[PDB]
Amino acid sequence: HHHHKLPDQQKVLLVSFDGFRWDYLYKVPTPHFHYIMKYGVHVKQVTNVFITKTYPNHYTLVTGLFAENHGIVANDMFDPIRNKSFSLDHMNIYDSKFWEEATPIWITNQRAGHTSGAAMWPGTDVKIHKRFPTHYMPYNESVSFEDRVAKIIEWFTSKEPINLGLLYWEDPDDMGHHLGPDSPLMGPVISDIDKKLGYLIQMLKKAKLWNTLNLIITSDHGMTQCSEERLIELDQYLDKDHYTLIDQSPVAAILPKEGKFDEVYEALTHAHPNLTVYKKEDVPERWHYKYNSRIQPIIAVADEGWHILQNKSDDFLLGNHGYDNALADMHPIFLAHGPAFRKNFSKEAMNSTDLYPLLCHLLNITAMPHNGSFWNVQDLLNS
Ligand SMILES: *[C@@H]1O[C@H](CO)[C@@H](O[C@@H]2O[C@H](CO)[C@@H](O)[C@H](O)[C@H]2NC(C)=O)[C@H](O)[C@H]1NC(C)=O
Ligand SMILES: *[C@@H]1O[C@H](CO)[C@@H](O)[C@H](O)[C@H]1NC(C)=O
Ligand SMILES: *[C@@H]1O[C@H](CO)[C@@H](O)[C@H](O)[C@H]1NC(C)=O
Ligand SMILES: *[C@@H]1O[C@H](CO)[C@@H](O)[C@H](O)[C@H]1NC(C)=O
Ligand SMILES: [Zn+2]
Ligand SMILES: [Zn+2]
Numbered sequence: 001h002h003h004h005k006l007p008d009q010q011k012v013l014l015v016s017f018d019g020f021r022w023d024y025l026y027k028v029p030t031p032h033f034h035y036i037m038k039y040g041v042h043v044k045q046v047t048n049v050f051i052t053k054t055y056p057n058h059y060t061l062v063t064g065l066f067a068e069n070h071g072i073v074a075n076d077m078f079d080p081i082r083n084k085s086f087s088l089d090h091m092n093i094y095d096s097k098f099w100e101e102a103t104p105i106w107i108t109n110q111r112a113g114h115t116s117g118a119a120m121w122p123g124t125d126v127k128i129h130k131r132f133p134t135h136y137m138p139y140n141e142s143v144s145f146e147d148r149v150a151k152i153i154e155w156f157t158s159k160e161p162i163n164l165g166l167l168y169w170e171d172p173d174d175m176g177h178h179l180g181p182d183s184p185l186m187g188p189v190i191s192d193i194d195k196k197l198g199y200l201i202q203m204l205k206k207a208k209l210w211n212t213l214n215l216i217i218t219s220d221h222g223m224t225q226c227s228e229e230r231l232i233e234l235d236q237y238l239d240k241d242h243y244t245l246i247d248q249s250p251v252a253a254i255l256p257k258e259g260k261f262d263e264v265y266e267a268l269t270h271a272h273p274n275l276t277v278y279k280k281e282d283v284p285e286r287w288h289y290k291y292n293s294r295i296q297p298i299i300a301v302a303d304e305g306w307h308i309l310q311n312k313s314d315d316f317l318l319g320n321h322g323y324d325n326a327l328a329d330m331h332p333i334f335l336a337h338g339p340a341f342r343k344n345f346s347k348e349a350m351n352s353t354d355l356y357p358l359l360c361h362l363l364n365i366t367a368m369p370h371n372g373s374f375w376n377v378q379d380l381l382n383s
C-alpha cells in the first residue's frame, strides 16, 4: 500500500546504429556496449528479414511484419499496380501509399493517447495513414548525433512527454561500405559509436531518465566483404534493352520488357555459379519475400560477398549487405537496459520480427497483427 500512486514508466527509446554487425562489439574495446550488457540484456545475433537492407528492416522493427507484408520490400522498388517508383538516391520516399500497407508503431502509440518522438528514423518524416510522429525531424544526414539526442531528451522531459523515442544514425553502415568490414580502419569507426553510445547514456543520466526508461540498442543489418574478384556482370549475359533493373545488388530485382521474360530468365539461370535466379513465384518461403505486387518478376540473389553490376567497369563498395538473412554477416546487434529488462542476461538468438510485440508490451498498447511472438522474447523481462 502506497499513499501516492507509483509511477508506471512504460517508456522506450529505440536506437538504431545502421549496419552494426553482431560481432563489431568484439573488433575493438566497447566499454559502453559492455556496460549495457553488464546491467541489461544482450542477444548475440539477431535474425533480420530478407532482403537485409536498411528500409525494409527498420520498418519490420516498427511493424513486426515480414517485408512482403509491410510493403517496404527494398530501398529501390517499383509499384506495377500504380506505376510509381520509390528510391533513396534522391530521397524519393514520401509517397505515403508505399508505406501504408502496414501501420508503424508510433501511429498505434498515438492512437492510444500517447505521444511519440522521432530523430531521423526511416519513415518518421513521411505522412503515413495521414499522420506523423507527435514530434519528428526532417531527414538530414548532416544533423549531428548530439543534436538528435538533444531533441529526444527534450521530448522526454517536456511538460507533455513522449513515451516512445526513435533514434537513428547512419554509421557504421556508411564507413563499413567504403572501408569494408575487414578493414582495420573500422576499429576507430566502431569505437566512435561506443563513444556516441556513452554520450547518450550520460545525457540520459543527466536528464534523470536512466532508471525510468527502457533503452534499446539495435540495428537493421550487418555487413560483408566484397571484392573485385567477386563481381557478376549483367552485360555479359543480358541486353540492357531487354529488361529494367529496379534494384541492383546483391538482390537484383529485374523487370523484363514485354515478351522478353523467357529470354531474360534463361540467360540468368545459366549465367553464374554464384547467382541464383528465382521466379517471383519460386522465391524460397523462408525469406517471406514473394506475396507482394512490388516483388519483381525475377529475383536474382548473389552469394555472400558477391556483387552484381551491369558493367564490370562500374563502381562498387568494399562492404555491402542485403544477402540471405540466414548469413551471420547480415545479423545485427541487440542490447537493452531499463527497469523492465533483466540485468546481466544474455540470449543466443532473437528474431527481429519479435521486437514489435515486445515494444507494444513495454508501452502497454495493443499490437497490430504481426509475424512475431512476444513469447519468444519474454525471457528478456523481469516478469
Ligand atoms: C504475417 O502476418 C500477417 C498478418 O497477421 C499475415 O497476413 C494475413 O494473412 C491472413 C491469412 O493468410 C489474411 O486473412 C490477412 O488479410 C493477412 N493480412 C495482411 C496484412 O496481409 C501473413 O500471412 C503473415 N505471414 C506469415 C509468413 O505468417
Ligand atoms: C541540414 O541541417 C543544417 C542545420 O539545420 C542546415 O544548415 C543544412 O542546410 C541542412 N541540409 C539540407 C540539405 O537541408
Ligand atoms: C560460389 O560458387 C562456388 C562454386 O563455383 C561455391 O563453391 C562457393 O561456395 C560459392 N560462394 C559462396 C560464398 O557460397
Ligand atoms: C525465429 O522464428 C522461427 C520461425 O519463425 C522459429 O522456428 C525460431 O524458433 C525463432 N527463433 C527465436 C530465437 O525466436
Ligand atoms: Zn542499414
Ligand atoms: Zn548500407
Ligand SMILES: [Zn+2]
Binding pocket: 174, 175, 177, 178
Ligand atoms: Zn557513403
